[PDB]
Design a protein around this ligand. Structure first.
Ligand SMILES: *[C@@H]1O[C@H](CO)[C@@H](O)[C@H](O)[C@H]1NC(C)=O
Ligand SMILES: O=S1(=O)CCN(Cc2ccco2)CC1
Length: 354
């Protein structure tokens, strides 16, 4: 169990102005720190944020958060469940800003909601330095789904924050799970007039303006004013990053298929070619990513699932691949770090989740 702490700086808030926070379980015999970013889509105007506040309020407010959380998967402290980092200091940062962790805007008489995701991460890091993070050797910033994209958007800013605060010895690294998407053509499509019809690129473009969203500086300088939405897409922002980042991505991600208007519910030839081309394109974007784990499965998220130990690529599990990554940051015989399936159809890998 990890224990809730609400942020001492109460000006760093969830959507509705309640304080943000983090759950923490300390491991005094360890100088490794894992900070995990929760996911859960986003909202991008008044209308659909109001809807989200009715039926997804824990993603917009801390008023109903429980006092403890059980760590699962990579956040578990039992070696049977977590072969990788079971003895680490564990932190779960709830997603209550609805901004893919990019926002820097307070609630005001102009703004019905606050979008403070980028500032929440910075304030959590600041307050943890007083609770033992000052002695760390590695800070691993991890996340799933919207939290995985949040890793890509924030890992270099955490590294810069610790450098400017006088801790140049802490090695900052990233682990992005299920946050690597393609701005591809949809299988069926519609013009953006409402939430159901707005393609990812157009919805993110509106969100960035609504949130006062922030992107990494080198990426921002490449694409420039009005085009910051490009930096939400992994294959475009990753080459601009300096911190080591490990990328976990199902080749047939259920959220990718959702935004592409694909439902698997007898597949004819047009859809067969579409699905095979999506897998090939995703594989192409990872070809020069040296730390990656990409199985040929239809699924979504993995690193905080308890059975995350089950899936294998070329005979190597995800906990093993992450351990090999650790060794590489001190090729290795029999301990690989780049693992991408080559078979072209969902569940052609027999270790895929059922
Ligand atoms: C609280 O957080 C806000 C937003 O990041 C910042 O402007 C302010 O300086 C912080 N307050 C303190 C006392 O650090
Ligand atoms: O799809 S998600 O789980 C993770 C990514 N975010 C924003 C996004 C959409 C496309 C690219 O980046 C939405 C929720």
């Amino acid at each position: 169990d990890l224990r809730l702490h609400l942020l001492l700086n109460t000006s760093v808030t969830c959507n509705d102005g309640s304080p943000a926070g983090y759950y923490l379980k300390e491991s005094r015999g360890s100088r490794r720190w894992l900070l995990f970013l929760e996911g859960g889509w986003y909202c991008f105007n008044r209308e659909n944020c109001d809807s989200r506040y009715d039926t997804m309020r824990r993603l917009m407010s801390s008023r109903d958060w429980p006092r403890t959380r059980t760590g699962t998967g990579i956040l578990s402290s039992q070696p049977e469940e977590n072969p990788y980092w079971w003895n680490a200091n564990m932190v779960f940062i709830p997603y209550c800003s609805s901004d893919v962790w990019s926002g820097a805007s307070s609630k005001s008489e102009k703004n019905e909601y606050a979008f403070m995701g980028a500032l929440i991460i910075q304030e959590v890091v600041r307050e943890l330095l007083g609770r033992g993070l000052s002695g760390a050797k590695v800070l691993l910033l991890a996340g799933s789904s919207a939290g995985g994209t949040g890793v890509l958007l924030n890992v270099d800013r955490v590294a810069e924050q610790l450098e400017k605060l006088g801790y140049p010895a802490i090695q900052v690294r990233g682990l992005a799970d299920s946050g690597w998407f393609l701005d591809n053509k949809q299988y069926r499509h519609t013009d953006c007039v409402d939430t159901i019809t707005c393609a990812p690129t157009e919805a993110i473009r509106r969100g960035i303006r609504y949130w006062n969203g922030v992107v990494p500086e080198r990426c921002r300088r490449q694409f420039q004013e009005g085009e910051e939405w490009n930096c939400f897409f992994g294959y475009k922002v990753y080459p601009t990053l300096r911190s080591p980042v490990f990328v976990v991505q199902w080749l047939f991600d259920e959220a990718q298929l959702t935004v592409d208007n694909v439902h698997l519910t007898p597949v004819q030839e047009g859809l067969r070619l579409y699905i095979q081309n999506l897998g090939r394109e995703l594989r192409h974007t990872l070809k020069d990513v040296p730390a990656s784990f990409a199985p040929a499965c239809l699924s979504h998220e993995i690193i905080i699932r308890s059975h995350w130990t089950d899936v294998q690529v070329k005979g190597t599990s995800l906990p093993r691949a992450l351990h090999c990554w650790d060794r590489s940051l001190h090729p290795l015989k029999g301990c690989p770090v780049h693992l991408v399936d080559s078979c072209p159809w969902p569940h052609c890998n027999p270790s895929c989740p059922t």
